Amino acid sequence: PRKKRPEDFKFGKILGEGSFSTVVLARELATSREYAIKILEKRHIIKENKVPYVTRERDVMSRLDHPFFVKLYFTFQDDEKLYFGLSYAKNGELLKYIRKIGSFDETCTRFYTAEIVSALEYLHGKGIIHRDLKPENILLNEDMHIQITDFGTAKVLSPESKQARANSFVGTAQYVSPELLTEKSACKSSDLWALGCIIYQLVAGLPPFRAGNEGLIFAKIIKLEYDFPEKFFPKARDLVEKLLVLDATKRLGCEEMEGYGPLKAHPFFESVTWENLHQQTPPKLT
Ligand SMILES: O=C1c2ccccc2-c2n[nH]c3cccc1c23
């Protein structure tokens, strides 16, 4: 289609702000479609060494074609700015709901965990590691299905070299894997560690390694220093114990543990119909 331009849209509210990008709601005049348009100022990204992250985001998003990921529809630029036209996920961050409700019941924990697992199966199947999986990066569309975002710190592993490990130091302290801290590399299984932290957070209300500053969190991660509250659903506790494993080759779902089949077969997921989750009606949070 014809390359789009800023004057093709009516821009509305800011949806999200980052250190070097802003996401604005926009309506395309010719179609009345709403998009979340991520806008980056060229001068700022150029001066602040952020171009590689922008190019990474574009390259990774261009490869994805799955209901549980934000879609990149179009890109364009003008003299000052770069624009990425993205899916609009009207209900915003999963984190908002955790904070408001406190924690999720078992049905809701299972459904949303299953969507995230299905998403990771797809991503890992394409040889891509997210590296910054967390509730702030898991958006909810109008129908309350997930849409994972934030691919500027993702990595396409090279199929040509059978690459398994990546060397860039990226992530968020609460969710970062022990291997990144200790061995200075991440792998697909690093996202499974983040998953285990997320499941824990949905049930407990807080992620498992927490402190008022990053170094203290790191110290806890490397020692596997965390505990479960009372009434933590037993099969979810079992699952989290199978994900929060220091040895990245021993996490349920990882390649050395024979992949997603055994993870999807975990007793916590007994009821789950995996093949068409995005067409199922999500359970109500309240
Ligand atoms: O931060 C948001 C965001 C925040 C609130 C509501 C919707 C969105 C939203 N919809 N699509 C995208 C793509 C990237 C980021 C964001 C979105």
UniProtKB/Swiss-Prot annotation:
Give the protein's biological function.
Serine/threonine kinase which acts as a master kinase, phosphorylating and activating a subgroup of the AGC family of protein kinases. Its targets include: protein kinase B (PKB/AKT1, PKB/AKT2, PKB/AKT3), p70 ribosomal protein S6 kinase (RPS6KB1), p90 ribosomal protein S6 kinase (RPS6KA1, RPS6KA2 and RPS6KA3), cyclic AMP-dependent protein kinase (PRKACA), protein kinase C (PRKCD and PRKCZ), serum and glucocorticoid-inducible kinase (SGK1, SGK2 and SGK3), p21-activated kinase-1 (PAK1), TSSK3, protein kinase PKN (PKN1 and PKN2).
The membrane-spanning stretches of this chain are none
One Gene Ontology term from the biological process aspect of the record: positive regulation of sprouting angiogenesis
- Protein's membrane topology: Peripheral membrane protein
Indicate where this protein is primarily found: cytoplasm
Q: Which reaction does it catalyse?
A: L-seryl-[protein] + ATP = O-phospho-L-seryl-[protein] + ADP + H(+); L-threonyl-[protein] + ATP = O-phospho-L-threonyl-[protein] + ADP + H(+)
Could you list this entry's UniProt keywords, alphabetically sorted: Acetylation, Activator, ATP-binding, Cell junction, Cell membrane, Cytoplasm, Kinase, Membrane, Nucleotide-binding, Nucleus, Phosphoprotein, Serine/threonine-protein kinase, Transcription, Transcription regulation, Transferase, Ubl conjugation
> Sites of the modification Phosphothreonine?
281
Q: In the UniProt annotation, what is the result of changing residue 168 to A? A: No activation
One annotated Gene Ontology cellular component of this protein: plasma membrane
- Region (PIF-pocket) location: 40-84
Q: Which domain of life is it from?
A: Eukaryota
List localization entries.
Cytoplasm; Nucleus; Cell membrane; Cell junction, Focal adhesion
**Range within the parent protein:** 74 to 359 of 556
Binding positions (ATP)? 19-21, 38, 87-89, 93, 136, 150
Q: Per its Swiss-Prot or TrEMBL record, what regulates the activity? A: Homodimerization regulates its activity by maintaining the kinase in an autoinhibitory conformation. The 14-3-3 protein YWHAQ acts as a negative regulator by association with the residues surrounding the Ser-168 residue. STRAP positively regulates its activity by enhancing its autophosphorylation and by stimulating its dissociation from YWHAQ. SMAD2, SMAD3, SMAD4 and SMAD7 also positively regulate its activity by stimulating its dissociation from YWHAQ.
**Enzyme class at the top of the EC tree:** transferase
Q: Where is the active site?
A: 132
Q: Which GO terms describe its molecular function?
A: 3-phosphoinositide-dependent protein kinase activity; ATP binding; phospholipase activator activity; phospholipase binding; protein serine kinase activity; protein serine/threonine kinase activity
This entry's Enzyme Commission designation comes to 2.7.11.1
Quaternary structure annotation from Swiss-Prot or TrEMBL: Homodimer in its autoinhibited state. Active as monomer. Interacts with NPRL2, PPARG, PAK1, PTK2B, GRB14, PKN1 (via C-terminus), STRAP and IKKB. Interacts with SGK3 in a phosphorylation-dependent manner. The tyrosine-phosphorylated form interacts with PTPN6. The Ser-168 phosphorylated form interacts with YWHAH and YWHAQ. Binds INSR in response to insulin. Interacts (via PH domain) with SMAD3, SMAD4 and SMAD7.
Written domain comment of the UniProt record: The PH domain plays a pivotal role in the localization and nuclear import of PDPK1 and is also essential for its homodimerization.
- The name under which this protein is listed is 3-phosphoinositide-dependent protein kinase 1
Please verify whether the record's keywords include Cell membrane.
yes
| Induction remarks | Stimulated by insulin, and the oxidants hydrogen peroxide and peroxovanadate.
Q: Which organism is it from?
A: Homo sapiens
